[PDB]
Design a protein around this ligand. Structure first.
Ligand SMILES: N#Cc1[nH]c(Br)cc(=O)c1O
Ligand SMILES: [Mn+2]
Ligand SMILES: [Mn+2]
Length: 179
């Protein structure tokens, strides 16, 4: 029950509510799949931090599927960018490309390969963050300036260390749930 307490204590209510909604979609109980719960919250918060550091970015993640696809289709219709096969996380209006955001407890390159093999689209930019301050991005183009990426890396490390002080990090990292 400690993972749920930590989640509600370190993530703001909006993020927690969105994550619980995602889990209700999956038919998953956040009191049981606690690690997936924390992972969902962390990925949501990274996506929102990313989109706020720009308005440069359009947030697709966190919307219900109806709204997410409505926004994707609006962007495609008004830009001509090819429609992604999977719901991406953001749209970058400056570079004019969709972005998939990855947050992993494994090596950034392994998860990068996983994401790139999955989405199978040369056009969606991919950006992977770890909990150790590492990143990897398509073409090594990290989109953001050093300060914003620093802010995200700090937040992720801090989440890791909070989990560690509560003896939660070990279970969370050995689990691939949420990636
Ligand atoms: N939608 C969605 C989604 N689901 C998992 Br699992 C990992 C992600 O990075 C992501 O954007
Ligand atoms: Mn997503
Ligand atoms: Mn993502």
């Amino acid at each position: 029950s400690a993972m749920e307490d930590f989640v509600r204590q370190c993530f703001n209510p909006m993020i927690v509510e969105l994550a619980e909604k995602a889990m209700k979609e999956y038919g998953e109980d956040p009191k049981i799949e606690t690690n997936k719960f924390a992972a969902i919250c962390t990925h949501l918060e990274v996506c929102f931090m990313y989109s706020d550091f720009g308005h440069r970015f359009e947030i697709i993640e966190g919307r219900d599927r109806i709204m997410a696809w409505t926004v994707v289709n609006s962007i495609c219709n008004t830009t001509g960018v090819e429609k992604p096969k999977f719901l991406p996380d953001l749209y970058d209006y400056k570079e004019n490309r969709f972005i998939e955001i990855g947050v992993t407890r494994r090596e950034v390159h392994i998860y990068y390969l996983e994401k790139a093999n999955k989405i199978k689209s040369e056009k969606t930019h991919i950006h992977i963050f770890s909990f150790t301050g590492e990143e990897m991005a398509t073409k090594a183009d990290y989109t953001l300036d050093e300060e914003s990426r620093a802010r995200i890396k700090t937040r992720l490390f801090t989440i890791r260390q909070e989990m560690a002080s509560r003896s939660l990090w070990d279970s969370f990292r050995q689990s691939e749930r949420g990636e």
